[PDB]
Amino acid sequence: APKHSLDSKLLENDDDVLDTIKYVHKEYLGKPYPGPLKNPKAPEEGRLPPNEGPDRGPHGLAHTVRTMACAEVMIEEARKAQLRGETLGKAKNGQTLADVTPEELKKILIAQAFFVVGRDDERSGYDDVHKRNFYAEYHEKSEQAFRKYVEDNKLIGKIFKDQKEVDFYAAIILDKNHEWDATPAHILINQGHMVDLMRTKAPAEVALERTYNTLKGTVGSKGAEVVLKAHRDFFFATGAVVPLVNPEAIDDPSRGGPYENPYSGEKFVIVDDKVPASKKDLPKAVNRDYKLKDNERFLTIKEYYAFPDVQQTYPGYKTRLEASSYYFPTPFAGECEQNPAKCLGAIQKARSKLQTDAIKNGFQSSSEKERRQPNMDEIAAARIIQQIMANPDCIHDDHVLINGQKLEEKFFRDLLAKCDMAVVGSLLNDTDIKNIDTLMRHEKNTEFHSTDPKAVPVKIGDAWENRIRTKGGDVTQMKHDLIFLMQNDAWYFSRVNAIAQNRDKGSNFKEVLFTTLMTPLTNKSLIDTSHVPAPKKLYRGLNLPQEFTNKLINQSNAIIANTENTLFTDLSAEAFKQIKLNDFSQMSGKTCASTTKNMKLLTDIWGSNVIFEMLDPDGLLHPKQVGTHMAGSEDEFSVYLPEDVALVPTKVTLEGKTDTGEDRYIFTLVAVKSPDFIPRHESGYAVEPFMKMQKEKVTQALDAIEKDVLKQQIEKKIMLQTQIIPALTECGEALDKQNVTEALQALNKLPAEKEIGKVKTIGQELRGQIVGVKQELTGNLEPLQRATTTPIVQDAEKIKVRYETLLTDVTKRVTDFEKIKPANLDGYNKAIADLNNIQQELNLLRNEKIRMHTDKDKAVDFSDIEALDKRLQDVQSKLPTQLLE
């Protein structure tokens, strides 16, 4: 856990930065280029004409906004990289970019807003014609403007501490010697400006490589990729032109282009076409004006990137980048220059889009949005639930008996834990809704306990009938009353939410029965009731001890610090590994969660110390207003999370203190849907009891049959011993085999009702029983045959590549663990923790390998994972011996 937040978003919230941008845009930037003075000491002499177009194209408001956003992103990534643990570079003060406080960040942004407002034309460097240096004069103008601004608004005492701070920032802005690495502010301004100006220098590929090499030592390799990707997105959002990056001349030119350091002018000369084989083989670089003679040749970009050492060291050797004119976001940059708000909003939009797209590309793409067809076991569970609804007399105080078969608390509990509740509830109907009230009538006297140990036990049936049960309401009104019962959290909701997630401890049989019965029906009511315009933000309250809160914060920080939107290479494999191992979205629950739009109600009424904020850009969540709005308040919503939708954190903010003095944290979660999150299913766990009931019914039919003029009797015996008895035996085997097709075949083999009616010697009781068996098996098995195949994760390529990358990574980590030789208690504890997390990673590998298995008739292999586990156990045995020695 770092001492500062992983997120810095000053531009979105801060007021002083926006005010400064508005002031500078209204005064200096939003005006045509005036042209430099012919004589600084004599204004009357006039001005030289501007060297380029009078419009502020290159150095307009767009440049300032992009540079400030890039500086903020640089601090973002520096903090992330410090959190991951890899060492960062140091400025000459010994400070690291992660160590700058937010106050210094605000000062840096304010002093960066004035970095370009002094210019008058596009001339650069020393001039031969007049022996002048326009750069120094322009930045002197900028320094004077900064001093005037800080004096005018009495800013000293408000942000800046004293005069020396203002003088330090003025010396930063003046840039007399290009002291590029004096202190973090120097770097954060200068290299940001260089990154932004990268787009104009040519050739583009060498400039990009040089900028990567500059950023690598300061922020890190992954940071040097992320910052460039973010700046490319800002370029496309604001509307600048970007030269084409083509480091291997795939477009088939005659040559890739001469190699040339754009800032310095270096060129590598070969003597007699002797192509080298490594960067070290290159002779020293000649200057820009060196001439070629005889049979000498300039080093070409293609040949330069054909070298192996450059290929290994610099990741961008193989990549190719999209040209701007191909997407043509042109030329609405001139339109963005008109107002700061447009460009600032676009910058914020791009910044959020990058973070969301990183995770979404890390996981598998959404194949379809339509919901799955039900699994055979879920259809069976829905039928079981409806059959229980049929009558409550069959319910006993410690077990459930139905159709001659008993059920334990274990069956209901693992049915809740394993199967979907949404589809099962959707399979039910309104007759079950009325049977709800019938059950409430039957179960009037049973007790119920809340999660508070001091709560008085209540009889749920009496409470329902008196308070919840509306006088003579229609079925929709009972659905709204069920939602209304969900509203009363204190006495009933806590027990349900604890039972449905195995958080329950000590509840008896009737409570778990009621939970597994009510959850699908309540969700059914929620889908059936109404449709409401869904808000795009939801706040959910929770109360947690600090011990759990610290682990939650650490998990969120790790997830945030590992997700990165790299440009050159793909780190999607690492994001997938880190999310699955550390995600906490299983705590968000699989029940009706009560949320609200208004943070004020949570902070005032409840005063909870943990708050979740859910974002739904895709509309994956489907929140519903709480039934009868006539009594239900506006700010009360219910949300049901499907299994293939998981929540991941992107922000962790310390907002304030509760009335008890406890720190209150506000998370932010982005909802992502992917087939990867569908849990593995132990299919057939609930089909077995259903098949047992069907077999019992068929056996009772056989019982009546063996309990049961001569021509009619002989024809009765013919029809029995030919059609039914063999068919009953066949369907008995089929149910024993749990084969629907064979049961259906025995069904077709069974005679028709009218054929039985022809045989008068068959008693009407047996005829009715046999026809009832036939119809019941038909209507129960035909839906049971539907959708017997679970939807398949068909993206084999992505899963295979991810598995290979993860396998390489875990093998490397196992080798690193093998290298370890401890010497004290602390090393032993660290090794134990590392072994534990590596074993968790191996479990992740096991799950991924199981998902990779597509054939039904082959066993899943764990030879590699078990080999690494054996190596780890050998190291675990060796470690105490080395420690003892």
Coordinates of N, CA and C in Angstrom, one line a residue, residues 624-715:
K624 N -33.4 -1.9 -11.3 CA -34.9 -1.8 -11.4 C -35.4 -0.9 -10.2
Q625 N -36.3 0.0 -10.5 CA -36.9 0.8 -9.4 C -37.7 -0.2 -8.5
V626 N -37.8 0.2 -7.2 CA -38.4 -0.7 -6.2 C -39.9 -0.7 -6.2
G627 N -40.5 -1.5 -7.1 CA -41.9 -1.8 -7.2 C -42.8 -0.6 -7.0
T628 N -43.6 -0.5 -6.0 CA -44.6 0.5 -5.7 C -43.9 1.8 -5.3
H629 N -43.7 2.7 -6.3 CA -43.1 4.0 -6.1 C -44.0 4.9 -5.3
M630 N -45.3 4.5 -5.1 CA -46.2 5.3 -4.3 C -45.7 5.4 -2.9
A631 N -45.0 4.4 -2.4 CA -44.5 4.5 -1.0 C -42.9 4.4 -1.1
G632 N -42.4 3.6 -2.1 CA -41.0 3.5 -2.3 C -40.4 4.8 -2.7
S633 N -39.3 5.2 -2.1 CA -38.6 6.5 -2.4 C -37.9 6.4 -3.7
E634 N -37.6 7.5 -4.3 CA -36.9 7.6 -5.6 C -35.5 6.9 -5.6
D635 N -34.7 7.1 -4.5 CA -33.4 6.7 -4.5 C -33.2 5.3 -3.8
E636 N -33.9 4.3 -4.4 CA -33.8 2.9 -3.9 C -33.9 2.0 -5.2
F637 N -32.8 1.3 -5.5 CA -32.7 0.4 -6.6 C -32.2 -0.9 -6.2
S638 N -32.6 -1.9 -7.0 CA -32.1 -3.3 -6.8 C -31.3 -3.7 -8.1
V639 N -30.2 -4.4 -7.8 CA -29.3 -4.9 -8.9 C -29.0 -6.3 -8.7
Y640 N -29.1 -7.1 -9.8 CA -28.7 -8.5 -9.8 C -27.5 -8.8 -10.7
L641 N -26.4 -9.2 -10.2 CA -25.2 -9.5 -11.0 C -25.3 -10.8 -11.7
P642 N -25.3 -11.0 -13.0 CA -25.1 -12.3 -13.6 C -23.7 -12.8 -13.3
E643 N -23.5 -14.1 -13.6 CA -22.3 -14.8 -13.3 C -21.2 -14.3 -14.3
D644 N -21.5 -14.1 -15.5 CA -20.5 -13.7 -16.6 C -20.2 -12.2 -16.5
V645 N -20.7 -11.5 -15.5 CA -20.4 -10.1 -15.3 C -19.7 -10.0 -14.0
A646 N -18.5 -9.4 -14.0 CA -17.7 -9.2 -12.8 C -17.2 -7.8 -12.7
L647 N -17.1 -7.3 -11.5 CA -16.7 -6.0 -11.2 C -15.2 -5.9 -10.9
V648 N -14.5 -4.9 -11.4 CA -13.1 -4.7 -11.2 C -12.8 -3.3 -10.8
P649 N -11.9 -3.1 -9.9 CA -11.6 -1.7 -9.4 C -10.7 -0.9 -10.2
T650 N -11.0 0.4 -10.3 CA -10.1 1.3 -11.0 C -9.7 2.5 -10.2
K651 N -10.3 2.8 -9.1 CA -10.0 4.0 -8.3 C -10.2 3.6 -6.8
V652 N -9.3 4.2 -6.0 CA -9.4 4.0 -4.6 C -9.1 5.4 -4.0
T653 N -10.2 6.0 -3.4 CA -10.1 7.4 -2.9 C -10.5 7.4 -1.4
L654 N -9.6 8.1 -0.7 CA -9.9 8.4 0.7 C -10.6 9.7 0.8
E655 N -11.9 9.7 1.0 CA -12.8 10.8 0.9 C -13.0 11.6 2.2
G656 N -13.1 10.9 3.3 CA -13.4 11.6 4.6 C -13.5 10.7 5.7
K657 N -13.8 11.2 6.9 CA -13.9 10.5 8.1 C -15.4 10.3 8.5
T658 N -15.8 9.2 9.0 CA -17.1 9.0 9.6 C -17.3 9.7 10.9
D659 N -18.5 9.7 11.4 CA -18.8 10.4 12.7 C -18.1 9.7 13.8
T660 N -17.6 8.4 13.7 CA -16.8 7.7 14.6 C -15.3 7.9 14.5
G661 N -14.9 8.8 13.5 CA -13.5 9.0 13.2 C -12.8 8.0 12.3
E662 N -13.6 7.0 11.8 CA -13.0 6.1 10.9 C -12.9 6.6 9.5
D663 N -11.8 6.3 8.8 CA -11.6 6.7 7.5 C -12.6 6.1 6.6
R664 N -13.2 6.9 5.7 CA -14.2 6.4 4.7 C -13.6 6.3 3.3
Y665 N -13.6 5.1 2.7 CA -13.1 4.9 1.4 C -14.2 4.8 0.4
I666 N -13.9 5.3 -0.9 CA -14.9 5.2 -2.0 C -14.2 4.5 -3.1
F667 N -14.6 3.3 -3.5 CA -14.1 2.6 -4.6 C -14.8 2.9 -5.9
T668 N -14.3 2.5 -7.0 CA -15.0 2.6 -8.3 C -14.8 1.3 -9.0
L669 N -15.9 0.8 -9.5 CA -15.9 -0.5 -10.2 C -16.5 -0.3 -11.6
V670 N -15.8 -1.0 -12.6 CA -16.3 -1.0 -14.0 C -16.8 -2.4 -14.3
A671 N -18.0 -2.5 -14.8 CA -18.6 -3.8 -15.0 C -18.2 -4.3 -16.4
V672 N -17.6 -5.5 -16.4 CA -17.1 -6.1 -17.6 C -17.8 -7.5 -17.8
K673 N -18.3 -7.8 -19.0 CA -18.9 -9.0 -19.4 C -18.0 -9.8 -20.3
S674 N -17.8 -11.1 -19.9 CA -16.9 -11.9 -20.7 C -17.2 -13.4 -20.4
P675 N -17.2 -14.3 -21.4 CA -17.5 -15.7 -21.2 C -16.5 -16.3 -20.2
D676 N -15.3 -15.7 -20.0 CA -14.3 -16.2 -19.2 C -14.8 -16.3 -17.7
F677 N -15.7 -15.5 -17.3 CA -16.1 -15.5 -15.9 C -17.2 -16.5 -15.6
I678 N -17.6 -17.3 -16.6 CA -18.6 -18.4 -16.3 C -18.0 -19.4 -15.5
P679 N -18.4 -19.7 -14.2 CA -17.8 -20.8 -13.4 C -18.0 -22.1 -14.0
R680 N -17.1 -23.1 -13.7 CA -17.3 -24.4 -14.0 C -18.4 -25.1 -13.2
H681 N -19.2 -26.0 -13.9 CA -20.4 -26.5 -13.3 C -20.3 -28.0 -13.1
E682 N -20.7 -28.4 -11.9 CA -20.8 -29.9 -11.6 C -22.2 -30.4 -12.1
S683 N -22.3 -30.5 -13.4 CA -23.6 -30.9 -14.0 C -24.1 -32.3 -13.5
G684 N -25.4 -32.4 -13.5 CA -26.0 -33.7 -13.0 C -26.2 -33.8 -11.5
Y685 N -25.8 -32.8 -10.7 CA -25.9 -32.9 -9.3 C -27.4 -32.9 -8.9
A686 N -28.3 -32.2 -9.6 CA -29.7 -32.1 -9.3 C -30.5 -32.9 -10.2
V687 N -30.0 -33.4 -11.3 CA -30.8 -34.3 -12.2 C -31.0 -35.6 -11.6
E688 N -30.1 -36.1 -10.7 CA -30.3 -37.4 -10.1 C -31.5 -37.5 -9.2
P689 N -31.8 -36.6 -8.3 CA -33.1 -36.8 -7.5 C -34.3 -36.7 -8.4
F690 N -34.3 -35.8 -9.4 CA -35.4 -35.7 -10.3 C -35.7 -37.1 -11.0
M691 N -34.6 -37.7 -11.5 CA -34.7 -39.0 -12.1 C -35.2 -40.0 -11.1
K692 N -34.8 -39.9 -9.9 CA -35.3 -40.8 -8.8 C -36.8 -40.6 -8.6
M693 N -37.3 -39.4 -8.6 CA -38.8 -39.2 -8.5 C -39.5 -39.8 -9.7
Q694 N -39.0 -39.6 -10.9 CA -39.6 -40.2 -12.1 C -39.6 -41.7 -12.0
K695 N -38.5 -42.3 -11.6 CA -38.5 -43.7 -11.4 C -39.4 -44.2 -10.4
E696 N -39.6 -43.5 -9.3 CA -40.5 -43.8 -8.2 C -42.0 -43.8 -8.8
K697 N -42.3 -42.8 -9.6 CA -43.6 -42.7 -10.1 C -43.9 -43.9 -11.1
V698 N -42.9 -44.2 -11.9 CA -43.1 -45.3 -12.8 C -43.2 -46.7 -12.1
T699 N -42.5 -46.8 -11.0 CA -42.5 -48.0 -10.2 C -43.9 -48.1 -9.5
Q700 N -44.5 -47.0 -9.0 CA -45.8 -47.0 -8.5 C -46.9 -47.4 -9.5
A701 N -46.7 -46.9 -10.8 CA -47.5 -47.4 -11.9 C -47.4 -48.9 -12.0
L702 N -46.2 -49.4 -12.0 CA -46.0 -50.9 -12.1 C -46.6 -51.6 -10.9
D703 N -46.6 -50.9 -9.7 CA -47.3 -51.5 -8.6 C -48.8 -51.7 -8.8
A704 N -49.4 -50.6 -9.3 CA -50.8 -50.7 -9.7 C -51.1 -51.8 -10.7
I705 N -50.1 -51.9 -11.7 CA -50.3 -52.8 -12.8 C -50.2 -54.3 -12.2
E706 N -49.3 -54.6 -11.3 CA -49.3 -56.0 -10.9 C -50.4 -56.2 -9.9
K707 N -51.0 -55.1 -9.3 CA -52.2 -55.3 -8.5 C -53.3 -55.7 -9.5
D708 N -53.4 -55.1 -10.7 CA -54.4 -55.5 -11.7 C -54.1 -56.9 -12.2
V709 N -65.7 -61.9 -22.6 CA -65.0 -61.5 -21.4 C -63.5 -62.0 -21.4
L710 N -63.3 -63.3 -21.8 CA -62.0 -63.8 -21.9 C -61.2 -63.1 -23.0
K711 N -61.8 -62.8 -24.1 CA -61.1 -62.1 -25.2 C -60.7 -60.7 -24.8
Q712 N -61.6 -60.0 -24.0 CA -61.2 -58.7 -23.5 C -60.0 -58.8 -22.5
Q713 N -60.1 -59.9 -21.6 CA -59.0 -60.1 -20.7 C -57.7 -60.4 -21.4
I714 N -57.8 -61.3 -22.4 CA -56.6 -61.7 -23.2 C -56.0 -60.5 -23.9
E715 N -56.9 -59.6 -24.5 CA -56.4 -58.4 -25.1 C -55.8 -57.4 -24.1

